[PDB]
Motif scaffolding. Structure first.
Motif, PDB file in Angstrom:
ATOM      1  N   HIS A 101       6.080  17.349  -1.475  1.00  8.29           N
ATOM      2  CA  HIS A 101       5.755  16.976  -2.867  1.00  8.29           C
ATOM      3  C   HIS A 101       6.431  15.636  -3.180  1.00  8.29           C
ATOM      4  O   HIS A 101       6.384  14.761  -2.295  1.00  8.29           O
ATOM      5  N   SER A 102       7.060  15.477  -4.357  1.00  6.44           N
ATOM      6  CA  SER A 102       7.642  14.216  -4.838  1.00  6.44           C
ATOM      7  C   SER A 102       9.158  14.090  -4.628  1.00  6.44           C
ATOM      8  O   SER A 102       9.745  13.100  -5.099  1.00  6.44           O
ATOM      9  N   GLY A 103       9.792  15.036  -3.920  1.00  3.20           N
ATOM     10  CA  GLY A 103      11.244  15.014  -3.687  1.00  3.20           C
ATOM     11  C   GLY A 103      11.761  13.716  -3.078  1.00  3.20           C
ATOM     12  O   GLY A 103      12.822  13.241  -3.444  1.00  3.20           O
ATOM     13  N   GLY A 104      10.971  13.145  -2.174  1.00  5.02           N
ATOM     14  CA  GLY A 104      11.206  11.824  -1.574  1.00  5.02           C
ATOM     15  C   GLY A 104       9.871  11.102  -1.609  1.00  5.02           C
ATOM     16  O   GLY A 104       9.252  11.012  -2.663  1.00  5.02           O
ATOM     17  N   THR A 105       9.419  10.585  -0.480  1.00  6.16           N
ATOM     18  CA  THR A 105       8.118   9.937  -0.362  1.00  6.16           C
ATOM     19  C   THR A 105       7.121  10.934   0.198  1.00  6.16           C
ATOM     20  O   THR A 105       7.341  11.488   1.271  1.00  6.16           O
ATOM     21  N   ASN A 106       6.008  11.131  -0.499  1.00  2.02           N
ATOM     22  CA  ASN A 106       5.043  12.121  -0.077  1.00  2.02           C
ATOM     23  C   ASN A 106       4.265  11.692   1.178  1.00  2.02           C
ATOM     24  O   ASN A 106       3.592  10.643   1.200  1.00  2.02           O
ATOM     25  N   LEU A 107       4.358  12.517   2.215  1.00  2.00           N
ATOM     26  CA  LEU A 107       3.751  12.200   3.493  1.00  2.00           C
ATOM     27  C   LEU A 107       2.225  12.221   3.402  1.00  2.00           C
ATOM     28  O   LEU A 107       1.584  11.298   3.936  1.00  2.00           O
ATOM     29  N   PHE A 108       1.657  13.256   2.765  1.00  2.00           N
ATOM     30  CA  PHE A 108       0.205  13.326   2.584  1.00  2.00           C
ATOM     31  C   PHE A 108      -0.363  12.029   1.978  1.00  2.00           C
ATOM     32  O   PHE A 108      -1.276  11.444   2.532  1.00  2.00           O
ATOM     33  N   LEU A 109       0.199  11.591   0.855  1.00  2.00           N
ATOM     34  CA  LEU A 109      -0.377  10.426   0.130  1.00  2.00           C
ATOM     35  C   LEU A 109      -0.223   9.161   0.954  1.00  2.00           C
ATOM     36  O   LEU A 109      -1.132   8.337   1.025  1.00  2.00           O
ATOM     37  N   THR A 110       0.933   9.033   1.580  1.00  2.00           N
ATOM     38  CA  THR A 110       1.223   7.897   2.469  1.00  2.00           C
ATOM     39  C   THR A 110       0.215   7.843   3.630  1.00  2.00           C
ATOM     40  O   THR A 110      -0.307   6.780   3.923  1.00  2.00           O
ATOM     41  N   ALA A 111      -0.042   8.992   4.217  1.00  2.00           N
ATOM     42  CA  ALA A 111      -0.967   9.160   5.329  1.00  2.00           C
ATOM     43  C   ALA A 111      -2.386   8.821   4.945  1.00  2.00           C
ATOM     44  O   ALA A 111      -3.060   8.151   5.717  1.00  2.00           O
ATOM     45  N   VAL A 112      -2.809   9.194   3.733  1.00  2.00           N
ATOM     46  CA  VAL A 112      -4.172   8.797   3.231  1.00  2.00           C
ATOM     47  C   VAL A 112      -4.280   7.280   3.204  1.00  2.00           C
ATOM     48  O   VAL A 112      -5.278   6.711   3.691  1.00  2.00           O
ATOM     49  N   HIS A 113      -3.251   6.617   2.656  1.00  2.00           N
ATOM     50  CA  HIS A 113      -3.234   5.150   2.595  1.00  2.00           C
ATOM     51  C   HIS A 113      -3.253   4.532   4.013  1.00  2.00           C
ATOM     52  O   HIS A 113      -4.069   3.683   4.289  1.00  2.00           O
ATOM     53  N   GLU A 114      -2.372   5.002   4.890  1.00  2.00           N
ATOM     54  CA  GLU A 114      -2.286   4.486   6.260  1.00  2.00           C
ATOM     55  C   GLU A 114      -3.549   4.711   7.087  1.00  2.00           C
ATOM     56  O   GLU A 114      -4.001   3.805   7.814  1.00  2.00           O
ATOM     57  N   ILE A 115      -4.138   5.894   6.961  1.00  2.00           N
ATOM     58  CA  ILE A 115      -5.409   6.196   7.658  1.00  2.00           C
ATOM     59  C   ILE A 115      -6.518   5.231   7.210  1.00  2.00           C
ATOM     60  O   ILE A 115      -7.313   4.762   8.046  1.00  2.00           O
ATOM     61  N   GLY A 116      -6.518   4.865   5.927  1.00  2.00           N
ATOM     62  CA  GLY A 116      -7.470   3.886   5.401  1.00  2.00           C
ATOM     63  C   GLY A 116      -7.439   2.568   6.155  1.00  2.00           C
ATOM     64  O   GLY A 116      -8.499   2.060   6.573  1.00  2.00           O
ATOM     65  N   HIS A 117      -6.218   2.062   6.361  1.00  2.00           N
ATOM     66  CA  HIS A 117      -5.944   0.913   7.246  1.00  2.00           C
ATOM     67  C   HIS A 117      -6.388   1.171   8.713  1.00  2.00           C
ATOM     68  O   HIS A 117      -7.077   0.333   9.285  1.00  2.00           O
ATOM     69  N   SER A 118      -6.051   2.343   9.261  1.00  2.00           N
ATOM     70  CA  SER A 118      -6.481   2.765  10.617  1.00  2.00           C
ATOM     71  C   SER A 118      -7.984   2.704  10.818  1.00  2.00           C
ATOM     72  O   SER A 118      -8.444   2.446  11.939  1.00  2.00           O
ATOM     73  N   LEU A 119      -8.721   2.967   9.739  1.00  2.00           N
ATOM     74  CA  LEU A 119     -10.193   2.922   9.714  1.00  2.00           C
ATOM     75  C   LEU A 119     -10.814   1.561   9.379  1.00  2.00           C
ATOM     76  O   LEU A 119     -12.021   1.411   9.519  1.00  2.00           O
ATOM     77  N   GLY A 120      -9.984   0.587   8.971  1.00  2.00           N
ATOM     78  CA  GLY A 120     -10.384  -0.796   8.737  1.00  2.00           C
ATOM     79  C   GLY A 120     -10.351  -1.270   7.298  1.00  2.00           C
ATOM     80  O   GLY A 120     -10.747  -2.389   7.056  1.00  2.00           O
ATOM     81  N   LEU A 121      -9.894  -0.453   6.344  1.00  2.00           N
ATOM     82  CA  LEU A 121      -9.793  -0.897   4.936  1.00  2.00           C
ATOM     83  C   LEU A 121      -8.590  -1.792   4.716  1.00  2.00           C
ATOM     84  O   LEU A 121      -7.527  -1.548   5.296  1.00  2.00           O
ATOM     85  N   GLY A 122      -8.756  -2.797   3.860  1.00  2.00           N
ATOM     86  CA  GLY A 122      -7.637  -3.547   3.298  1.00  2.00           C
ATOM     87  C   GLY A 122      -7.201  -2.955   1.969  1.00  2.00           C
ATOM     88  O   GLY A 122      -7.575  -1.826   1.625  1.00  2.00           O
ATOM     89  N   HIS A 123      -6.407  -3.719   1.218  1.00  2.00           N
ATOM     90  CA  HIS A 123      -5.910  -3.274  -0.094  1.00  2.00           C
ATOM     91  C   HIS A 123      -6.905  -3.466  -1.207  1.00  2.00           C
ATOM     92  O   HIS A 123      -7.815  -4.299  -1.126  1.00  2.00           O
ATOM     93  N   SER A 124      -6.702  -2.671  -2.255  1.00  2.00           N
ATOM     94  CA  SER A 124      -7.530  -2.646  -3.444  1.00  2.00           C
ATOM     95  C   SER A 124      -6.722  -3.224  -4.591  1.00  2.00           C
ATOM     96  O   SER A 124      -5.506  -3.044  -4.647  1.00  2.00           O
ATOM     97  N   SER A 125      -7.416  -3.909  -5.492  1.00  2.00           N
ATOM     98  CA  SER A 125      -6.854  -4.327  -6.771  1.00  2.00           C
ATOM     99  C   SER A 125      -6.976  -3.237  -7.845  1.00  2.00           C
ATOM    100  O   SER A 125      -6.402  -3.395  -8.912  1.00  2.00           O
ATOM    101  N   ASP A 126      -7.697  -2.144  -7.570  1.00  2.00           N
ATOM    102  CA  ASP A 126      -7.775  -1.017  -8.489  1.00  2.00           C
ATOM    103  C   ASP A 126      -6.484  -0.194  -8.426  1.00  2.00           C
ATOM    104  O   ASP A 126      -6.211   0.424  -7.386  1.00  2.00           O
ATOM    105  N   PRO A 127      -5.714  -0.128  -9.538  1.00  2.00           N
ATOM    106  CA  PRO A 127      -4.517   0.757  -9.554  1.00  2.00           C
ATOM    107  C   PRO A 127      -4.765   2.267  -9.344  1.00  2.00           C
ATOM    108  O   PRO A 127      -3.837   2.971  -8.972  1.00  2.00           O
ATOM    109  N   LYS A 128      -5.985   2.738  -9.607  1.00  2.00           N
ATOM    110  CA  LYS A 128      -6.400   4.116  -9.282  1.00  2.00           C
ATOM    111  C   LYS A 128      -6.685   4.369  -7.807  1.00  2.00           C
ATOM    112  O   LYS A 128      -6.699   5.521  -7.379  1.00  2.00           O
ATOM    113  N   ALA A 129      -6.913   3.310  -7.035  1.00  2.00           N
ATOM    114  CA  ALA A 129      -7.223   3.426  -5.611  1.00  2.00           C
ATOM    115  C   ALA A 129      -6.010   3.863  -4.771  1.00  2.00           C
ATOM    116  O   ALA A 129      -4.880   3.415  -4.998  1.00  2.00           O
ATOM    117  N   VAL A 130      -6.242   4.768  -3.817  1.00  2.00           N
ATOM    118  CA  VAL A 130      -5.248   5.099  -2.797  1.00  2.00           C
ATOM    119  C   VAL A 130      -4.850   3.851  -1.955  1.00  2.00           C
ATOM    120  O   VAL A 130      -3.688   3.731  -1.521  1.00  2.00           O
TER     121      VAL A 130
END
Ligand SMILES: O=C1NC(=O)[C@](CNC(=O)c2cnn(-c3cccc(F)c3)n2)(C2CC2)N1
Ligand SMILES: [Ca+2]
Ligand SMILES: [Ca+2]
Ligand SMILES: [Ca+2]
Ligand SMILES: [Cl-]
Ligand SMILES: [Zn+2]
Ligand SMILES: [Zn+2]
Length: 158
Positions: A101-130
């Motif tokens: 959960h939020s006790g430290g850095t959430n692994l699930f949420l971090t992994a969603v972001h990192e996998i996005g990069h693994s698949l070829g996505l760059g960063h978003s200017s949308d603050p709602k975006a993972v």
């Protein structure tokens, strides 16, 4: 940038953070891959031997690629876009404290972001975006990709 020229993609967990139970690490990673497979034709499989497309690594400091991690805070993880070898791989900074959960850095949420990069996505200017650059915790029970995220990944993979 490049995309994966195949729909069956494998991952392997190289090593486990001592921060979490191993089953929680497996679960967070599996669920992270599921986020992206739900909106694309890509299928993700965990393998336990041989070379996977996406190697998941926990490491600290300088750890054998061009980019050292930086201690607790700042950079949480990094990943490499599609391609052979180090391409696709996702590295998590062991100097962070990884949590379910939020006790430290959430692994699930971090992994969603990192996998996005693994698949070829760059960063978003949308603050709602993972794929927004700034990590923030969100209720993982109500977690969903933004419209910006889904458009992004579907432009690469249909
Ligand atoms: O992958 C990376 N891209 C980057 O620009 C850095 C810095 N960012 C992070 O460390 C990071 C990790 N996860 N999140 C995150 C953001 C928004 C929502 C969410 F759920 C997670 N940000 C950089 C290349 C070292 N690493
Ligand atoms: Ca790889
Ligand atoms: Ca760090
Ligand atoms: Ca740690
Ligand atoms: Cl927690
Ligand atoms: Zn690395
Ligand atoms: Zn990023």
């Amino acid at each position: 940038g490049p995309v994966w020229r195949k729909h069956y993609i494998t991952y392997r967990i190289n090593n486990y953070t001592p921060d979490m139970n191993r089953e929680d690490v497996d679960y967070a990673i599996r669920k992270a891959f599921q986020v992206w497979s739900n909106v694309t034709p890509l299928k993700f499989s965990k393998i336990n031997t041989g070379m996977a497309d996406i190697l998941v690594v926990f490491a600290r400091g300088a750890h054998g690629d061009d980019h050292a991690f930086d201690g607790k805070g700042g950079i949480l993880a990094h990943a490499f876009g599609p391609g052979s070898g180090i391409g696709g791989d996702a590295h998590f900074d062991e100097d962070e404290f990884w949590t379910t959960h939020s006790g430290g850095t959430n692994l699930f949420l971090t992994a969603v972001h990192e996998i996005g990069h693994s698949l070829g996505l760059g960063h978003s200017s949308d603050p709602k975006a993972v794929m927004f650059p700034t990590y923030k915790y969100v209720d993982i029970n109500t977690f969903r990709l933004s419209a910006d995220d889904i458009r992004g990944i579907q432009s690469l993979y249909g």
